[PDB]
């Protein structure tokens, strides 16, 4: 900082790996820096996607009419001039990777909205991006389910986790109110695109073939990898449904589009009623199946039981699903998943009053739960419908939720879990407003003040 009020600002151009220095004052505008930068470099290059980034303060400087002073920029500031759009790999719930070049300066809520728009997935507010602890798009392909490649694959990615370790993964949910650039996400990193909240608004087969498919896939993989538990009976039905879904997905039909439902009798191989005998319903529409349990159930079932027996059990369950349309079957899979005892709870490591060890705070669409970190058993439950407000003490990382009856719930998390938990609470409140909404357009402003307005 010179006596004449001027100083030299250093700017690193990221895709050129050149450093540029400019003499400025506090009254120089952001846009003035940009123009001087482009002028000084003197290169026949398209700069129009480049923006100023301030690493130390983790903030983009996008308002060209603001002075350096207003931005709080002083003599010791090191800036970058960098493309706003950068490569990102998204792993979808169907476990496939899609490459996208997204705006690293947009708030993640907006990025997720734009991603979901181009993938034809309604209600982006239900999904988000999660840090990990390549499919080429074809028309409507994101609606098309595929069976797992081989039982060998499934076995290798089957690595059962203690609940405590599953809970720690939830530290990775991105802050929906900040950009990718601000959250240590690097170019070409892989992030998971996942259904984050377990309240699915207006799941409608007419419009939601891709949405329903990816939700079904999320459920299917959670079950096959035993991230959520079900009974034997339930597993055999999940297996029968996947079998039916897989068969319809790959059998050629009269339908010209992937983004659409498929009836059993529309399948090219389907036999019409009365075709084999004037006695309809005497023999099934699909006369032959090739049920093989090896890709239909979790590998634990294979260890436990002979495949002959599992085959028989799946065929028994299959009798109930043989007439379902493709999307009907996916919906029934999702509904069975929704009915599971542990469905829809997101767990965080937390400490509670009286506790001698780490426990879990469970968050569901309608309730908060104090839970045992080893068994996952509910110790105590508080209902969102009674919630008045909550507090976060950022110094001791304590969340305090105030209910009617002057009931109070307090718990302590890591700093990162506090931020994630806070957004989950605001987020579920935001989702609960959708039924009454007379506007019907996504209300991102209400989401933003519910999760980062204070």
From Swiss-Prot:
Signal peptide: none annotated. It is found in: Cytoplasm; Cytoplasm, Cell cortex; Cytoplasm, Cytoskeleton; Cytoplasm, Cytoskeleton, Stress fiber. Detected in adult heart muscle (at protein level). Detected in heart, skeletal muscle and testis. GO terms for molecular function: actin filament binding; phosphatidylinositol-3,4,5-trisphosphate binding; protein serine/threonine kinase activator activity; protein serine/threonine kinase binding; SMAD binding; type I transforming growth factor beta receptor binding. Residues 139-436 form the FERM domain. The modification Phosphoserine is found at residues 260, 272, 441. It is a peripheral membrane protein. Residues 29-70 are annotated as: Interaction with membranes containing phosphatidylinositol phosphate. SMART domains: B41 (SM00295), PH (SM00233). It comes from the Eukaryota. Keywords: Cell adhesion, Cell junction, Cell membrane, Cell projection, Cell shape, Cytoplasm, Cytoskeleton, Lipid-binding, Membrane, Nucleus, Phosphoprotein, Wnt signaling pathway. Interacts with ITGB1; the interaction is inhibited in presence of ITGB1BP1. Interacts with FBLIM1. Interacts with active, unphosphorylated CTNNB1. Identified in a complex with CTNNB1 and TCF7L2/TCF4. Interacts with ILK, ITGB1 and ITGB3. Belongs to the kindlin family. The FERM domain is not correctly detected by PROSITE or Pfam techniques because it contains the insertion of a PH domain. The PH domain binds phospholipids. Binds preferentially phosphatidylinositol-3,4,5-trisphosphate, and has lower affinity for phosphatidylinositol-4,5-bisphosphate. This is Fermitin family homolog 2. The lineage of its organism: Eukaryota, Metazoa, Chordata, Craniata, Vertebrata. The gene is Fermt2.
């Amino acid at each position: 900082m010179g006596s004449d009020g001027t100083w030299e600002l250093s700017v690193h151009v990221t895709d050129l790996n050149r450093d540029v220095t400019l003499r400025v004052t506090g009254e120089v505008h952001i846009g003035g820096v940009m123009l001087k930068l482009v002028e000084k470099l003197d290169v026949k290059k398209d700069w129009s996607d480049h923006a100023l980034w301030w690493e130390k303060k983790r903030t983009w400087l996008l308002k060209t009419h603001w002075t350096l002073d207003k931005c709080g920029i002083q003599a010791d500031a090191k800036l970058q001039f960098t493309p706003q759009h950068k490569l990102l790999r998204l792993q979808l719930p169907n476990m496939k990777y899609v490459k996208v070049k997204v705006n690293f300066s947009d708030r993640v809520f907006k990025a997720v909205s734009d991603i979901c728009k181009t993938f034809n997935i309604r209600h982006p507010e239900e999904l988000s991006l999660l840090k990990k602890p390549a499919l080429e798009l074809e028309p409507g392909i994101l609606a098309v389910s595929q069976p797992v490649t081989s039982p060998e694959i499934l076995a290798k990615m089957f690595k059962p986790q203690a609940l405590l370790d599953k809970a720690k993964t939830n530290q990775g949910w991105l802050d929906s109110s900040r950009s990718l650039m601000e959250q240590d996400v690097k170019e070409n990193e892989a992030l998971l695109l996942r259904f984050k909240y377990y309240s699915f608004f207006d799941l409608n087969p007419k419009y939601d073939a891709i949405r329903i498919n990816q939700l079904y896939e999320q459920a299917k993989w959670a079950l096959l990898l035993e991230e959520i538990e079900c009974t034997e009976e339930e597993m055999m039905m999940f297996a029968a449904l996947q079998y039916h879904i897989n068969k319809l997905s790959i059998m050629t039909s009269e339908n010209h589009l992937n983004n659409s439902d498929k009836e059993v009798d529309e399948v090219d191989a389907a036999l019409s009623d009365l075709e084999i005998t004037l006695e309809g319903g005497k023999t099934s529409t699909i006369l032959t199946t090739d049920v093989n349990p090896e890709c239909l159930v979790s590998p634990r079932y294979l260890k436990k039981y002979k495949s002959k027996q599992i085959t028989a059990r799946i065929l028994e369950a299959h009798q109930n699903v043989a007439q379902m349309s493709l999307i009907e079957a996916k919906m029934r899979f999702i509904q069975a998943w929704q009915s599971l005892p542990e469905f829809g709870i997101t767990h965080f490591i937390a400490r509670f009053q009286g506790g001698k060890r780490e426990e879990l705070i469970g968050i569901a669409y309608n309730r908060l739960i104090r839970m045992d970190a080893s068994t996952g058993d509910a110790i105590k439950t508080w209902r969102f419908s009674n919630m008045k407000q909550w507090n976060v003490n950022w110094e001791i990382k304590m969340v305090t939720v105030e209910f009617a009856d002057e009931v109070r719930l307090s718990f302590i998390c890591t700093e990162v879990d506090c931020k994630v938990v806070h957004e989950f609470i605001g987020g579920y409140i935001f989702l609960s407003t959708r039924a009454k909404d007379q506007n019907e357009s996504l209300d991102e402003e209400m989401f933003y003040k519910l999760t980062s307005g204070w």
